[PDB]
Design a protein around this motif. Structure first.
Motif, PDB file in Angstrom:
ATOM      1  N   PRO A   1       0.761  -1.255   0.000  1.00  0.00           N
ATOM      2  CA  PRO A   1       0.000   0.000   0.000  1.00  0.00           C
ATOM      3  C   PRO A   1       0.790   1.303   0.000  1.00  0.00           C
ATOM      4  CG  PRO A   1       0.028  -0.845   2.180  1.00  0.00           C
ATOM      5  CD  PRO A   1       0.682  -1.914   1.316  1.00  0.00           C
ATOM      6  N   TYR A   2       0.359   2.222  -0.862  1.00  0.00           N
ATOM      7  CA  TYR A   2       0.955   3.546  -0.984  1.00  0.00           C
ATOM      8  C   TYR A   2      -0.119   4.546  -0.561  1.00  0.00           C
ATOM      9  CZ  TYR A   2       4.802   1.680  -3.803  1.00  0.00           C
ATOM     10  OH  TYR A   2       5.915   1.009  -4.242  1.00  0.00           O
ATOM     11  N   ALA A   3       0.260   5.538   0.239  1.00  0.00           N
ATOM     12  CA  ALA A   3      -0.714   6.521   0.693  1.00  0.00           C
ATOM     13  C   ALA A   3      -0.563   7.867  -0.007  1.00  0.00           C
ATOM     14  CB  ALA A   3      -0.607   6.693   2.199  1.00  0.00           C
ATOM     15  N   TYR A   4      -1.697   8.471  -0.348  1.00  0.00           N
ATOM     16  CA  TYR A   4      -1.722   9.781  -0.981  1.00  0.00           C
ATOM     17  C   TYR A   4      -2.807  10.569  -0.250  1.00  0.00           C
ATOM     18  CZ  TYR A   4       0.961   7.555  -4.682  1.00  0.00           C
ATOM     19  OH  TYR A   4       1.956   6.885  -5.347  1.00  0.00           O
ATOM     20  N   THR A   5      -2.423  11.708   0.308  1.00  0.00           N
ATOM     21  CA  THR A   5      -3.342  12.543   1.062  1.00  0.00           C
ATOM     22  C   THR A   5      -3.476  13.874   0.357  1.00  0.00           C
ATOM     23  OG1 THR A   5      -2.652  11.523   3.141  1.00  0.00           O
ATOM     24  CG2 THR A   5      -3.757  13.663   3.273  1.00  0.00           C
ATOM     25  N   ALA A   6      -4.712  14.288   0.118  1.00  0.00           N
ATOM     26  CA  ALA A   6      -4.938  15.543  -0.571  1.00  0.00           C
ATOM     27  C   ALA A   6      -5.048  16.686   0.414  1.00  0.00           C
ATOM     28  CB  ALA A   6      -6.216  15.460  -1.408  1.00  0.00           C
ATOM     29  N   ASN A   7      -4.260  17.733   0.189  1.00  0.00           N
ATOM     30  CA  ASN A   7      -4.355  18.914   1.031  1.00  0.00           C
ATOM     31  C   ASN A   7      -5.474  19.722   0.370  1.00  0.00           C
ATOM     32  OD1 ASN A   7      -4.191  21.523   2.101  1.00  0.00           O
ATOM     33  ND2 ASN A   7      -1.980  21.323   2.467  1.00  0.00           N
ATOM     34  N   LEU A   8      -6.634  19.750   1.014  1.00  0.00           N
ATOM     35  CA  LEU A   8      -7.794  20.460   0.478  1.00  0.00           C
ATOM     36  C   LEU A   8      -8.159  21.680   1.319  1.00  0.00           C
ATOM     37  CD1 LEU A   8      -9.777  17.224  -0.294  1.00  0.00           C
ATOM     38  CD2 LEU A   8      -9.055  18.894  -1.996  1.00  0.00           C
ATOM     39  N   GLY A   9      -7.267  22.056   2.233  1.00  0.00           N
ATOM     40  CA  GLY A   9      -7.511  23.195   3.092  1.00  0.00           C
ATOM     41  C   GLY A   9      -8.728  22.952   3.957  1.00  0.00           C
ATOM     42  N   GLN A  10      -8.891  21.725   4.424  1.00  0.00           N
ATOM     43  CA  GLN A  10     -10.038  21.406   5.244  1.00  0.00           C
ATOM     44  C   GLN A  10     -10.101  22.292   6.471  1.00  0.00           C
ATOM     45  OE1 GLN A  10      -8.674  17.296   4.548  1.00  0.00           O
ATOM     46  NE2 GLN A  10     -10.804  16.745   5.015  1.00  0.00           N
ATOM     47  N   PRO A  11     -11.281  22.879   6.722  1.00  0.00           N
ATOM     48  CA  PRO A  11     -11.489  23.762   7.866  1.00  0.00           C
ATOM     49  C   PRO A  11     -11.283  23.040   9.187  1.00  0.00           C
ATOM     50  CG  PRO A  11     -13.593  23.071   7.007  1.00  0.00           C
ATOM     51  CD  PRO A  11     -12.544  22.648   5.993  1.00  0.00           C
ATOM     52  N   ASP A  12     -11.432  21.721   9.183  1.00  0.00           N
ATOM     53  CA  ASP A  12     -11.263  20.956  10.414  1.00  0.00           C
ATOM     54  C   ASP A  12      -9.932  20.202  10.482  1.00  0.00           C
ATOM     55  OD1 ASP A  12     -13.401  18.130   9.466  1.00  0.00           O
ATOM     56  OD2 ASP A  12     -12.174  19.521   8.278  1.00  0.00           O
ATOM     57  N   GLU A  13      -8.992  20.569   9.617  1.00  0.00           N
ATOM     58  CA  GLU A  13      -7.682  19.935   9.622  1.00  0.00           C
ATOM     59  C   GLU A  13      -6.675  20.990  10.020  1.00  0.00           C
ATOM     60  OE1 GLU A  13      -6.651  16.636   9.198  1.00  0.00           O
ATOM     61  OE2 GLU A  13      -5.010  17.706  10.173  1.00  0.00           O
ATOM     62  N   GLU A  14      -5.864  20.683  11.024  1.00  0.00           N
ATOM     63  CA  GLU A  14      -4.862  21.629  11.493  1.00  0.00           C
ATOM     64  C   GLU A  14      -3.417  21.145  11.325  1.00  0.00           C
ATOM     65  N   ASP A  15      -3.225  19.903  10.892  1.00  0.00           N
ATOM     66  CA  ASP A  15      -1.867  19.380  10.733  1.00  0.00           C
ATOM     67  C   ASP A  15      -1.772  18.318   9.635  1.00  0.00           C
ATOM     68  OD1 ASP A  15       0.835  18.850  11.158  1.00  0.00           O
ATOM     69  OD2 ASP A  15       0.546  17.850  13.093  1.00  0.00           O
ATOM     70  N   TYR A  16      -1.775  18.766   8.378  1.00  0.00           N
ATOM     71  CA  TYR A  16      -1.698  17.879   7.216  1.00  0.00           C
ATOM     72  C   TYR A  16      -0.410  17.069   7.145  1.00  0.00           C
ATOM     73  CZ  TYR A  16      -5.941  19.190   4.558  1.00  0.00           C
ATOM     74  OH  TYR A  16      -7.242  19.341   4.115  1.00  0.00           O
ATOM     75  N   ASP A  17       0.710  17.686   7.517  1.00  0.00           N
ATOM     76  CA  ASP A  17       1.995  16.995   7.466  1.00  0.00           C
ATOM     77  C   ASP A  17       2.041  15.755   8.342  1.00  0.00           C
ATOM     78  OD1 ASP A  17       3.275  18.895   5.683  1.00  0.00           O
ATOM     79  OD2 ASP A  17       3.291  20.260   7.404  1.00  0.00           O
ATOM     80  N   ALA A  18       1.236  15.733   9.396  1.00  0.00           N
ATOM     81  CA  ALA A  18       1.215  14.581  10.282  1.00  0.00           C
ATOM     82  C   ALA A  18       0.601  13.329   9.653  1.00  0.00           C
ATOM     83  CB  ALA A  18       0.472  14.930  11.553  1.00  0.00           C
ATOM     84  N   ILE A  19      -0.313  13.519   8.700  1.00  0.00           N
ATOM     85  CA  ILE A  19      -1.012  12.405   8.066  1.00  0.00           C
ATOM     86  C   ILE A  19      -0.135  11.426   7.280  1.00  0.00           C
ATOM     87  CG2 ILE A  19      -2.876  11.771   6.490  1.00  0.00           C
ATOM     88  CD1 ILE A  19      -4.322  14.363   7.259  1.00  0.00           C
TER      89      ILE A  19
END
Ligand code: CIR
Ligand code: CIR
Ligand code: CIR
Ligand code: CIR
Ligand code: ASP
Ligand code: ASP
Ligand code: ASP
Ligand code: ASP
Lengths: 432, 432, 432, 432
Positions: free
Chosen positions: D37-55
Motif C-alpha cells: 500500500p501507498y498513501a496519498y493525502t490531498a491537502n484540500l484546506g479542510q477547515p477541520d484539519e490543522e496538521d496535514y503533514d502529520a497524516i
C-alpha cells in the motif's frame, strides 16, 4: 429621433442599391427632392445576378452622388459555415429545414454596408424592406450596432413618396418622365431575396396556401417535382477538418467561397434542400415561404451525420437545443448579440472542432438521397470485452428503487384521477 | 434478487414467444431442465407476420404449459398517435427522423404481456433481448412497473444455456435432437424488430458504416433507391380533428388500427420515412440502424405542417423542446414515468387539441415529396389594416436602449480579447 | 386605432380608479372636457388599504357617471397559489426570489375590471401606468384578451392633459380649483404597487443603487434589518393536500383568502421573503425594485421542501425550467397565453398533485430560518437490501466505454488547442 | 476487469489516505494480506484539519510503502471560482442553494491523486466511499479519465475485509492487535466531507427528517440558530474584475486561496450559506444533507447581483439554464466531460468576462442580509429621451394580431373543454 419620417433635404443619404425600379426610382426622387443620395450595392454572389459591376453604374446614371460595390461574399460564407457548425436553423416542418439564409445575408449586409457608409461620412441609411416584415428590423438592428449615430430614412415609407410614386406603374412612368428610356422587367408571381447561401421566395401568389412549389422557377436548382426533367443519381463526398468543410468529391478549394459555390452546383443538380415553411415573423404574425439552399443542405447533412458518430447524447441534445435557440436569434436579427454569440462560440469550440471526417451520399431528386459511407478518425461509434452480462445485471438492478418510486406515482396519479388506470393491468391511460 | 442468473427449476416462467429458433429452443431447453414455460405472443400487426395464430400453437408443440396470443394493436397505435401528437422523436440526422417505433412497441409489449402473465399467476419473465442493447432495459422497466413482484430469467444469458446451446447451428440441431423435424429460415445480413408502427434493422452487416440501405430489403415499403422500380407520383390528403388522424384521402375508418394500416400502405408505395441513424444507446455506446415507418412519417409531416399554421412561436419552440426530451425518455424506456407523462399530457392537451385541418401532399420517391395545400379552420396564418407604418417605427425605436447595450458589449468583448473586432468596422469576429 | 391619443369627447370611458390624485384629477378633467367617466376599483386585499368602500364614493363625489368596487381577492389568491405550485418566479438574485406579485395582480385586475366594464357597455379603458413600464403593456394585453372591441385612452398620456395638469402640485391645485377641499398625502421616496400577494416598491430614490431596503417602510412586514426591533424566533407548520395549502400551524380555513391572509401575518412578523432585484423590463431596459411577499415566501419554502422529498430528478429539473419560463411569461403579461397555460397546467397536474405533506420551520429575521421537520405520505425519500455492492460494481463498469470516449475528447481538445492540458497529468485546463 | 473484487496480493495499491480508522486499518490489513500500500493525502484546506503533514507520517507508521501529501488547494479554488462564475449549482430549496462543494472536491482530488500515483508507477486505486453513494462513482470516473490503465480496489468492499473487520470497534481492536496504542476519536451523529469550499454533513442521525441543523456543530461558521450566540451586523464589500473575485473589503490578495480563505472567515462569522437539502443521488434514490459554504455563498450573492445589473434577459436565462444543467453534471462526476466543458467555457467567456464591479452587503444571521450598494463600470442599469410615449403606442399596437390569436385559442380551449371559461367574462379557468 432615429427614424426620419420625411426626406432629410440637403443631407447625404446612403441607400442599399440592389438595382431595380424601387431603388432606382428612389434615387431619382430623393435627388429630385433635394437630398444627396449615395448608393451601396452588396456583392452577395446572388445566383440570379450575372453583372454586379453594372449596378453601381446604373446608380450613377440615375443621379447618385457616388456609387460603390461592397464585396460581402467572404463574410457571408464564413457566417453560413458558422450556422452550419451550430445547426442554427429553427424553422422546420416534418424535419425539412429553412437554413436562415436571408437572416445570414442581413447580418452581413446590414453591418458591412453601414460600415462602408461610415467611411464616406454618410450617417443616414435606407433600404427597401417593408414595414410589415422581418428585414426592416434586421437592417435596423445591424445598422445601429455598427454605427451609433445612424439615422434611418426609407423613402418607400414616406407618405410624400407614396402619394407621388404609388406602385410599379407609377414608378416606371416616373423613370420615363425623368428622362430615362426605362423598361421594367417581367413580374413574377412572388418576390425573392437571394444570396450565395440561398434564395427565399414569398409574397404575391405564394401567400395562398393552395399555391405550391409548382409555381416557383427555382434559381439555385432544378424542378425536381416535374417528372419530365431528368436527374441522374449522383454520388458525392463531403469532407470536414475540425468542423470546416474542406473537400467535395475529393477536391479542395483555394477559398471557402469557391467551396460553397461548388456545394451549390452539386446540390442544385438535384434540387436538394428545398422546403415550404409557414413561420412566425418577429412581429408575431405568420408568413409563408418557399426556400432554396442546395449547398447549405449538402453540408448540413454531412455535418450532422458525422456529429452522430462522434458526440455523446448530452452533447448532441445541447447542440440541437442551442442550435434551435440560436436559429431563432439569427432570424430575429440578434446574431451578434451576447445571447447568440455565447451559443455560437460554444458550439464552434466544443462540438464542431471534433467534426473531422467524410460522408458519402447518393443524391437523387429533391430531398431523396441515401447515405453510402461515413468515416472519421474521431468516431466513437465502433462496429466492434469491456463489460459482461453480469455487469449489465448490476446496472439494471440499480434501477429498482426509482422504478418502485414511479410505480407508486402511477398509483397516486390514478388515485387523484389523473390516470384512468396505472400500469397494474397494462398500459397506463391518462384520463381523457 | 430481481434477476435470476440460473434456471428456476420447478417454477412457472413466462417468455415472450415471438416464434423463431431462439424462443423455440429456449422453451424446449427450459421444459427440459425442469422449468414450466408459458408462452405469450404479442400481436403487434407486424408487416412481416402473416399468421399470428400459428405461433401459440408452435409454443404448445414445443412443450409450453400454455400459450397465449395477446392482441396489442389498439394500444400500440394509440401510443404511436400520442408520439405523433408530441413529436416525441429525438434521433434525427440532417432533419431525417427515427420515429422511436421499437421503443413504442416495448412500452406496450412490456406492460401488456407482463399483465397477462399476472393473470395466470406467472411471476417470472424472460425475453430474447441481449445484455448489450436497449431492449433488455426497456422490458425490465416496463415489466417491473406493471408487476412489483416480477423476477426476470433470460435463458439466453444463463451460462448453462450458452455452454450447451451456443449459436443458431447448435440450437437447430437441438431442435432436431429433441425430436422435431425443424428447418431454420434463411439468415439475413441484419436483424429486425418490427411492429405496425415501424421496422428497425441493425446488427450483422449493418454494423459497418460502409454498408448502406442498399443491403436492406424493406418490409414496409419499396426500394426507392433502385432506379428500376417504378414509383408513380401520388397525391394524398391527411386530415386531423383536434389532433387525431381521422381521414386519409377523404376516407374515415372504423378504428385507428385500420387508419394506421392505410397510412402504412400510402407511405409504403413510396418508401416515405426511411432513415439511417447512428445513435446513442442507454448504456452510452453507439449503435447504427436503418429504419422504416411509412405511416408514422406521413402523419408526422401533415401534423407539423398544420402546427406551423396554427401555433405561435413560443408554443412551437416548447413543442420541439419537450418533444425531443420526451423522445429520449421514450427511447430510455421511461415513457410512463412522471417526467415523460407531464410533457406528453401537456402537448396533447394544449398543442394537439387545436390541430384540426387537412394537408395535401404529392409523394414521389423516399423522402422526396411536395406540399400542395394546407387548410384549417384554426389557422392563425392569414393571406390577408391592424397596424400602420408609424406603429412599426415606434416598435423599432423601442429597441434602441438594448441595441446600445449590445454595442457596448461588443466593445467590451473586443477589449477583453474575445472578439477580434466589434461591429464598428463591419462583421464582429470571434477571436480564433 | 386601438389606442386613442386624445380624449373621446362624449364617450363612456372606464378607468381603474385606485383612488389618489392621479385618478381623481383625471376623473374631473375627463368629466370636464366632455367625456363620461366610469370608475372601477379592484378589491385586491391591499395591505395598506383599510376602507375600500370609501373609494367608489370618492369617484362619485368627483363626477363619475357610476362607480363600482370589483372584488378580485378570490381570483388573485387562486392565481397566486397556481404560481406557487409552478415555481413561476424568474427574477432571482443569489437565490432570493421576486414572487411576481404585481404581474399576478395585473392578470386578475386587467381581465376582471375590463369584463366588468363590458357588463356596463363601456368599451374604452384607461389606467395610470406609465409609457415606460411593464404595467401599461400587461393591462393592454389582458384587456384586449377579455374584450376584442376594447379601446384604450390614458389621459395621463394625452398631451392636452399633461400641458394643463403637469405634476402633483398642478393636479392638487386643479382639485381645489374644481371646488374640492382636497388635501394630498405625504409623498414617499418611492412608489408602491400592492395587493394581498405582495407589495412592490420602486422609482424615485429607489432608482439609485446606493439606496437600500433601509429607506423602505415595509407594509407587509417588520423592519428586520433594524437591530432594535425585537423579533422572537417562531415555529410554524405549513401543510398541503395534493399541492393545495390547507393548513397553517394545524389550523384549516373557510377559504383560501383567509389562508393567504394568515400566511401573510406569520411571514410578516419576520419580514420573510423581502428581496432587492435589478430586473429586465419587457422593453429591454433595467429597473430596480424592493419587494415584499411574506405569505408567498412561506408557502414557497414549504412547497419546495416537499417537492424535494417527493419527485425524481428529471421531474424536478423540468419544474425549475418550466417555472422559470412561465415566470417570465407571467411578467410579460402572457400568463393566459397558450405557451404559459401549457406549462402551468402541466406542473399543476403532474407535479403539484403529489405534494401532500407538512413542513415545520423556525422563522427568525428576514430570510434567516431553519427547517425543523418534513413529513409526507408521498415521500420517496426513506431513511432506510434492494441492491448489493456487486450490483454497483456492474453499474460502474457500464460507464467504461463512455469514459474512454471522454478521455479521447480531452486529448482531442488539447490537440486542437482548446485545453492547455487534458486529464493525463491532473485537472484539465481550458486554454486561457 | 476494472474493479478488483479481492485484494491484489503482491501489487502496489494506492489509497486516498485521509487519515482516520477506516484508511488506517485498511493500510495495515492490506500490508498484512500481502499487498504493497501507498498513501496519498490531498491537502484540500479542510477547515477541520490543522496538521496535514502529520497524516503521511501516520501512513508510514502504519506500514505504507511510501506516503505523499498532494497539495490541491490552488486547483480546488480555481474550480470553485469557475463554479461561481457559472452558477453551477442545481440543488436548491426555496432558493437556498447547495454549492456542490463535495463534487468540486472530487473532481480535483480524483484527478490529482491518481495522476500522482501515475508518477510512482502505481496503477491500482482505492478510496473509502461506500457502494451506496455518489462519491464512489465520482472517484471512479475522474480516476479512469486521468489513467486509462487504472484498476480499482476498495478493501472496504472486499467480503474478506468486512468478514474480519466489520465496524469501528473491530477496526480499533485491529489497530491494537496490530501493535498500535490506537485511540479512536469521539463519534458524531453524522458524517462530514469537508474542503476549503465547503463542508457537507449527512448520514447517521441526519437521515431522519426530524433531525435539523440544530444537531450540527458547524465547522466553517457559527451557530446562528442559537439565539444566545452574539452576531454583530457586518458590512462587507466584494469586488470582481472580469468575473474574478479580487477584493474583499477593499483588500486584494497574493493568490486566490488566500482570497477564498478570507471569504470563508467573513461568511463564517455569520453562518452565511448554510442549507438543508433532500436531493437525488446519481443512482436515483434520495439523500439528505446539511451544508456549509460561507465563502462560496458570499461570492455567489455579489456575483449574481452584478450579473443582474449587467446582462440582458436572454443572457441571464441562459446563465440560469446552463448553470443548473452544469451543476447536475458536476454532481454526477462529469465536470470534465464535453457536455459540461461546453457550458462552463461558454459562461466563463461571455457572461463572467463582463462581471466587473463591487457589491456592498450587510450580513446579519445565517442567510439574513441586505444589499447596500451595487456599482459597475459595465452596468446597463442606469437610474436615468430615447423613446417617446408615441413610440410605445406603436410597440403596443404591434401586439394586436397575436393577442387576437390568443383570444381565439382561449375560445378554442373552452370549446374543446380544456378551459371552464375563456377571458370573455374574466379570468380564464382551466377545467378541473
Ligand atoms: N422574398 C423575401 O422577401 N424573402 C426574404 C424573407 C425570407 C424569410 N421569410 C426570412 O424572414 O428569412
Ligand atoms: N433489430 C433490432 O434489434 N432493432 C431494435 C432496436 C432499434 C433501435 N436501435 C432502438 O433502440 O429503438
Ligand atoms: N411600484 C411599482 O410601480 N411597482 C410595480 C412593478 C413591480 C415590478 N417591477 C414588476 O414589474 O412586477
Ligand atoms: N458526509 C458526506 O458523505 N458528504 C459527501 C456528499 C455530500 C453531498 N450529498 C454530495 O453528494 O455532494
Ligand atoms: N423582405 C420582405 C419580407 C420580410 O422582410 O420579412 C419585406 O421587406 O417585408
Ligand atoms: N434488440 C437488440 C438491440 C437493442 O436491444 O437495442 C438487442 O436485444 O440487443
Ligand atoms: N407601475 C410602474 C412600473 C411598471 O409599470 O413596470 C409604471 O407604470 O411605469
Ligand atoms: N460519502 C458518502 C456519500 C456519497 O458518496 O454520496 C458515501 O461514500 O456514500
Amino acid at each position: 429621433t432615429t427614424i426620419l419620417k420625411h426626406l432629410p433635404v440637403g443631407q447625404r443619404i446612403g441607400i442599399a442599391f440592389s438595382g431595380g425600379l424601387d431603388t432606382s426610382a428612389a434615387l431619382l426622387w430623393m435627388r429630385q427632392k433635394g437630398a444627396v443620395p449615395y448608393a451601396y450595392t452588396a456583392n452577395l454572389g446572388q445566383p440570379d445576378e450575372e453583372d454586379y459591376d453594372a449596378i453601381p453604374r446604373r446608380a450613377m446614371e440615375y443621379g447618385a452622388e457616388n456609387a460603390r460595390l461592397i464585396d460581402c461574399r467572404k463574410q457571408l460564407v464564413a457566417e453560413g459555415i458558422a450556422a452550419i457548425q451550430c445547426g442554427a436553423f429553427h424553422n422546420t416542418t416534418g424535419g425539412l429545414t429553412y437554413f436562415n439564409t436571408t437572416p445570414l445575408g442581413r447580418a452581413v449586409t446590414g453591418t458591412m454596408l453601414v460600415a462602408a457608409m461610415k467611411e464616406d461620412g454618410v450617417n443616414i441609411w435606407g433600404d427597401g424592406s417593408t414595414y410589415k416584415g422581418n428585414d426592416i428590423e434586421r437592417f435596423y438592428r445591424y445598422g445601429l450596432l455598427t454605427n451609433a449615430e445612424l439615422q434611418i430614412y426609407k423613402p418607400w415609407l414616406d407618405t410624400d413618396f407614396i402619394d407621388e410614386l404609388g406602385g410599379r406603374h407609377e414608378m416606371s412612368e416616373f423613370m420615363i418622365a425623368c428622362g430615362f428610356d426605362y423598361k421594367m422587367s417581367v413580374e413574377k408571381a412572388y418576390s425573392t431575396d437571394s444570396n450565395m447561401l440561398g434564395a427565399t421566395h414569398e409574397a404575391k401568389d405564394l401567400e395562398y396556401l393552395n399555391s405550391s412549389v409548382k409555381i416557383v422557377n427555382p434559381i439555385m436548382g432544378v424542378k425536381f417535382w416535374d417528372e419530365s426533367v431528368k436527374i441522374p443519381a449522383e454520388e458525392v463526398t463531403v469532407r470536414f477538418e475540425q468542423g470546416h468543410p474542406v473537400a467535395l468529391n475529393g477536391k479542395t478549394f483555394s477559398d471557402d467561397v469557391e467551396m460553397m459555390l461548388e456545394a451549390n452546383r452539386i446540390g442544385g443538380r438535384h434540387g436538394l434542400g428545398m422546403s415550404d415553411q409557414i413561420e412566425n415573423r418577429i412581429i408575431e404574425a405568420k408568413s409563408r415561404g418557399i426556400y432554396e439552399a442546395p449547398g447549405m443542405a449538402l453540408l448540413h447533412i454531412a455535418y450532422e451525420r458525422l456529429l452522430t458518430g462522434i458526440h455523446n447524447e448530452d452533447t448532441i441534445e445541447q447542440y440541437h437545443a442551442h442550435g434551435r435557440q440560436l436559429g431563432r436569434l439569427l432570424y430575429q436579427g440578434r446574431w451578434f448579440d451576447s445571447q447568440a454569440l455565447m451559443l455560437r462560440d460554444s458550439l464552434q469550440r466544443w462540438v464542431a472542432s471534433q467534426i473531422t471526417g467524410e460522408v458519402t451520399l447518393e443524391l437523387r431528386r429533391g430531398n431523396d438521397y441515401s447515405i453510402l459511407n461515413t468515416v472519421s478518425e474521431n468516431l466513437t461509434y465502433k462496429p466492434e470485452s469491456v463489460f459482461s452480462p453480469d455487469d449489465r445485471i448490476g446496472q439494471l438492478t440499480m434501477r429498482n428503487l426509482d422504478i418502485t418510486d414511479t410505480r407508486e406515482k402511477l398509483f397516486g396519479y390514478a388515485k387523484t384521477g389523473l390516470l384512468s388506470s396505472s400500469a397494474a393491468s397494462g398500459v397506463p391511460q391518462v384520463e381523457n
